[PDB]
Amino acid sequence: AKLSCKICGYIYDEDEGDPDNGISPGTKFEDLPDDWVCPLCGAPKSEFERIE
């Protein structure tokens, strides 16, 4: 699944992960640490919303 950061143009795609910050491809959003934030703008998980 894919989730948009409400606050910038970033999209978290579970099939991409966030590898530059230590999150492997295939990591589900539910499994991101509670201290994970958007790699571009620092918004928390509460500021992401599922998109198609």
Which residues between 1 and 52 bind Fe ion (CB under 5 A)?
A: 5, 7-8, 10, 38, 40-41, 43
Q: How far apart are CA 6 and CA 38, in angstroms?
A: 10
**Of 27 and 36, which has the nearer Cβ to Fe ion?**
36
CB of 28 to Fe ion, least distance (A): 19
Q: What string of DSSP letters covers the chain?
A: -EEEESSSS-EEETTT-BGGGTB-TT--GGGS-TT-B-TTT--BGGGEEEE-
Residues that bind Fe ion (CB under 5 A): 5, 7-8, 10, 38, 40-41, 43
Binding-site positions for Fe cation read 5, 8, 38, 41
